[PDB]
């Protein structure tokens, strides 16, 4: 007759985005596992390619030519950082940290060992210094529609010439029309952010900052943070954050219980 | 006069693989941190990859090229799989694990969800199924000289028609002189091991195991793990796994304390 609440719940987990009343759900459900055994078989038959990780290496591609450095920094960091980049039980990252032993962490964001590296490099580096990251990163979360507890992290920077915020949103538009991710900055150092709808695809920062000091930057400098898995959802126009995730339970959206 | 301990463990530190008594310490340290500096500019004007980035990428486009399906799963996995895997108090590898929250932990290696991604696969790929992965993985070590705590794994296997030792040893070649890394394997289901020199490179597996059965498979597969930190430490000739790793302290094997 009408379709169950679970049977619904069942045939939207086998429901890709492309897809598009009258059978019962043993048929519909038998309509979709072929669909998305045929997907899988495609895939494996040609490209083969991770989404995440194809993502990813297009991003790689992009700021490695656009002249930024590739950085891969630890993902286990001293428990210290998190409280030198201004994290105290005043804001709300202040649980949302992994706590791996009684000295360590997982990195909730990037930050930290980007700053170390741009003042490390300063000492070696022609004027501007450009360098950016992709990589895990966690945060523990409540929700779960657009928030991942394991997730990967863009952030790219640039500090000396040229830290305008004219050019960073310059960099902000080039990355995203390369991608082909419909976007909108909002703002009024700075703070801009880069929207999909009502989603948050990106905070960026126009800098110095008082908190450069902690870390012996003073000097100027521009940069942004993206969510890979964000990016994703909404190029593949995934209905939850779950199908562009690091999973057992999806592949490149495809759900793997058929 | 004569260097002292110290002087020389910081000359080392600025020294590379490829460099070749007399002058003091201050000039020896002089000309090194020229060159290292020259080193990173050269990389920051033409290249700007990172070894480990990179190599996961030359390594990516191998496996994919020879028919194998890429898979990125969550480096924070549940315990439990940590007891299925078959290691208790029994083992080594017990303690050498680092536990998050309470049901949690680091992955110490890629089979749990390398084993869950065949046992669902094959509900939908044609025979055999091949795939694997790359990525962070995390074992408390005493040593340091050959491990490091956060470091990076690759994990291939195939499961069905084909999966004899022969075929096994015939990817392991393939990859390496691919690389460009001598090797040599040594064993006597099976359990190979690809050396270099006195080092590990890689374990290798040619199974059916008993273990097989906790995960769902019930079929003839073959596979191996092996170590990109590693594997860079030989290609690149540094005399400590650290100048290949994730960190703070070294880019491509130069310092960046300069
Ligand atoms: N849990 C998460 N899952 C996916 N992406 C995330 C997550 N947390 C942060 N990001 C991404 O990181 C960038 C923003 O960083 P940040 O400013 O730390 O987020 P936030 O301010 O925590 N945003 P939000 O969690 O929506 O309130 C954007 O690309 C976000 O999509
Ligand atoms: N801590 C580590 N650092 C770097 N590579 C590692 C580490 N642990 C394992 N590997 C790599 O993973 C592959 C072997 O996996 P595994 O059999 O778990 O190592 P093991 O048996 O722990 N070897 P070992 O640590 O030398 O006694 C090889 O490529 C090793 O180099
Ligand atoms: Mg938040
Ligand atoms: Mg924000
Ligand atoms: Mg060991
Ligand atoms: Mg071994």
Not at 11 to 30: A, H, I, Q
Not at 63 to 81: A, C, N
Not at 202 to 207: E, I, K, P, Q
């Amino acid at each position: 007759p009408a379709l169950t609440k679970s049977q619904t719940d069942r045939l939207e987990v086998l429901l890709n985005p492309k897809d598009e009343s009258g059978k019962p759900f043993r048929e519909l459900e038998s309509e979709l596992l072929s669909r998305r055994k045929k997907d899988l078989q495609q895939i494996y038959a040609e490209e083969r390619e991770n989404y995440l990780g194809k993502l990813e290496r297009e991003i790689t591609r992009f700021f490695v030519d656009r002249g930024f450095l590739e950085i891969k920094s630890p993902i286990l960091i001293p428990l210290e950082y998190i409280e030198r980049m201004g994290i105290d039980n005043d804001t709300e990252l202040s649980k949302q940290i992994f706590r791996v032993d009684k000295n360590f962490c997982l990195r909730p964001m990037l930050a930290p060992n980007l700053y170390n590296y741009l003042r490390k490099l300063d000492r070696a580096l022609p004027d501007p210094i450009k360098i950016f990251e992709i990589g895990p990163c966690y945060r523990k979360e409540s929700d779960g529609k657009e928030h991942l507890e394991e997730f990967t992290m863009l952030n790219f920077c640039q500090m000396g010439s040229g830290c305008t915020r004219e050019n960073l949103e310059s960099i902000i538009t080039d990355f995203l029309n390369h991608l082909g991710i419909d976007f909108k900055i909002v703002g009024d150092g700075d703070t801009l952010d880069v929207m999909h709808g009502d989603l948050e695809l990106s905070s960026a920062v126009v800098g110095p900052i008082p908190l450069d000091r902690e870390w012996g930057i003073d000097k100027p400098w521009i940069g942004a943070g993206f969510g890979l898995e964000r990016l994703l959802k909404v190029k593949h126009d995934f209905k939850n954050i779950k199908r562009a995730a690091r999973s057992g339970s999806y592949y490149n959206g495809i759900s793997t219980n058929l």
